[PDB]
Design a protein around this ligand. Structure first.
Ligand code: FES
Ligand code: FES
Lengths: 77, 76
């Protein structure tokens, strides 16, 4: 009665296709004390305002069926 | 007769960035209050960390295997 199957989503594609490829490892570092009310940081490597999110993730998610979204650092209520 | 080999391919974009994390969530967003961070936090931007949303160094393997150049976000 039991039936088994699997969907394989593994790939070896680069995550970052185009951003600052002359940098061998892209790291950003910010001080909390110099942030505004909210900073929305990109985790999809498609934003035209990288390291900030510009909503590019939605196009990627729609295309590939992915579910990636940004990291938000904000001021508490 | 050029010495070049040309490859012309044609297919839809199927490569997900996130392979395994919280797949029942249609869009993964994390939001933290800056006041409640410690002295430092390091956030994964490669979706490979075993401690996502935190960077555990998994990006090194990804970059070596794929030729990529991704790394984390540090808030301090
Ligand atoms: S544009 Fe990349 S996470 Fe929004
Ligand atoms: S483990 Fe993903 S950016 Fe470090």
């Amino acid at each position: 009665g039991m039936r088994f199957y699997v969907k394989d989503h593994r790939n070896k594609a680069m995550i970052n296709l185009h951003i600052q490829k002359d940098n061998p490892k892209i790291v950003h570092a910010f001080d909390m004390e110099d942030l505004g009310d909210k900073a929305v940081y990109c985790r999809c490597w498609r934003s035209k305002k990288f390291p900030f999110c510009d909503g590019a993730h939605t196009k990627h998610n729609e295309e590939t069926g992915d579910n990636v979204g940004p990291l938000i650092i904000k001021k508490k209520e």
